[PDB]
Design a protein around this ligand. Structure first.
Ligand code: SLB
Ligand code: NA
Ligand code: NA
Length: 472
């Protein structure tokens, strides 16, 4: 059904990822190797790794589906992510590097106290358990109708093999597989779009024309304020705070800021990522618009009532030659596994620093830290894999991202804020996002904005009620 040459390409890719993992296992001697990489990561490799970490099977599948069913207005969030990178570099990254963090949330205790650090660390770890499971399950849903294998078998290939080379290679193995996987998914995106242009009569010219005449690029009717609809202004506010969370308060990205040996190489990490974000996501939106025009020209090739979420997988397996199809399936695996490996290692770095090291009376030996470092990757991987099986054979935590982001903004920008007012901001923001999510029809893009700003506002107002702020 799927073919032998297609599987041979896919398992050639899977073998390469395992090989990179074994290679970098040789230098895994301390937790500083496993989590910080010994400063041996060049900036450009960390930058590709940031890009591959954030871009999962979520973007690979649902962005073309989004452009297919609607328009391109969500691409604004891509360039808002680039727009905030100078602010990240000048205000946040100096603290992460000078504190020589393993976990980004060590900043929160240095600025406030262990309460804010534990809140953000537990929220991150719990959220990214789900992110791994959701990434695995989305890849299964997209590939199961076309690979002809049991869904648990697919979960083993996607998740378990990724756990193995992640546990094997440390952050360096994670980063260098991310480099390979980031180039692969990017090349896959360009290749997919090119081959749709050949199969559409009129080529890219007809795709652009048909999409524009259907008003499926940037409909001016979406330039309007709304409290319920994902209009252009709403998604701009939502993606702004979703990107600030991703690049200032999220360990899987912040950890990349400290694997480089210098500030100059860190700046190049952001530049490398910005170049990929400016170019590669365009192709995923273009793939969606191209698939729209294609199945408007060939409506018989579309099953009646077909779920649009799998319109890109449907095209890939039916309209692309031998070997190329498996290369594209490898790029899909690459998009999923580059995000899973980063989440697992980052969950382990947070547990190692914020939980294991911080909450133990005696100081764990370097031997003990390494054991827990490798252990948590297996445990976090097992539970998120079982959750993925649960999702196939048959939100609340996500609302904490706002408060996590507000804590960092409060500490970095509000000097009067202290440990007590930060905790007040946490509690107030949790009430605010739960009220907005469950007691209103507010658009989901407002959740992160309400969580972040409630910590900033309440953490600033109630600051006099508590002892002085630590200077840091
Ligand atoms: C603005 C935006 O769309 N952000 C999305 C990013 C970017 O698409 C990717 O980082 C390329 O910049 O990918 C995700 O993290 C993902 O696929 O898991 C989801 C997230 O919603
Ligand atoms: Na990825
Ligand atoms: Na990764």
């Amino acid at each position: 059904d799927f073919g032998f040459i297609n599987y041979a390409v896919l398992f050639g890719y899977l073998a390469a990822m395992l090989l990179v993992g074994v290679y970098f296992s040789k230098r895994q001697k301390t937790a500083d190797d496993y989590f910080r990489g010994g400063g041996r990561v060049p900036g450009w490799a960390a930058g590709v790794s940031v890009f591959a970490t954030t871009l999962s099977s979520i973007t690979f599948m649902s962005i073309p589906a989004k452009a297919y069913t609607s328009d391109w207005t969500f691409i604004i969030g891509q360039y808002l992510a680039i727009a905030i990178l100078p602010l990240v570099f000048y205000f946040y990254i100096p603290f992460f590097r000078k504190l020589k963090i393993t976990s980004a949330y060590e900043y929160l205790e240095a600025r406030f106290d262990v309460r804010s650090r534990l809140f953000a660390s537990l929220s991150f770890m719990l959220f990214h358990i789900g992110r791994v499971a959701i990434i695995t399950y989305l890849t299964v849903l997209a590939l199961r109708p076309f690979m002809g294998i049991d869904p648990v078998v697919l979960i083993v290939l996607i998740s378990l093999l990724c756990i193995i080379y992640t546990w094997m290679g440390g952050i360096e193995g994670v980063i260098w597989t991310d480099v390979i996987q980031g180039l692969l998914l990017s090349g896959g995106a360009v290749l997919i779009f090119i081959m749709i242009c050949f199969k559409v009569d009129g080529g890219i010219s007809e795709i652009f024309t048909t999409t524009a005449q259907a008003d499926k690029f940037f409909p001016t009717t979406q330039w309007r304020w709304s409290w319920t609809d994902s209009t252009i202004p709403v998604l701009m506010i939502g993606f702004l705070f979703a990107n600030i969370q991703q690049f200032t308060a999220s360990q899987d990205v912040v950890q990349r800021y400290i694997v480089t040996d210098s500030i100059k190489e860190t700046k190049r990490t952001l530049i490398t990522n910005a170049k990929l974000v400016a170019i590669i996501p365009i192709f995923f939106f273009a793939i969606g618009s191209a698939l729209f025009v294609y199945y408007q020209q060939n409506p018989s090739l579309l099953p009646a009532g077909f779920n649009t979420g799998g319109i890109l997988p449907l095209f890939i397996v039916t309209e692309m030659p031998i070997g190329i199809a498996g290369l594209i399936i490898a790029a899909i695996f690459a998009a999923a596994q580059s995000s899973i490996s980063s989440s697992l290692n980052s969950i382990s770095s947070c547990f190692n620093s914020d939980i294991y090291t911080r909450l133990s009376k005696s100081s764990p030996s370097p031997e003990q830290k390494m054991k827990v470092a490798k252990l948590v990757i297996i445990v976090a991987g097992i539970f998120s894999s079982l959750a993925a099986i649960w999702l196939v054979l048959s939100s609340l935590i996500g609302l904490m991202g706002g408060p996590m982001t507000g804590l960092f903004m409060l500490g970095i920008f509000v000097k009067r804020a202290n440990a007590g007012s930060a905790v007040v901001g946490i509690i107030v923001s949790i009430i605010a996002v739960l009220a907005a999510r469950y007691g209103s029809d507010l658009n989901f893009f407002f959740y992160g904005v309400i969580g972040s700003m409630s910590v900033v506002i309440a953490g600033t107002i109630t600051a006099p009620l508590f002892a002085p702020a630590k200077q840091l």
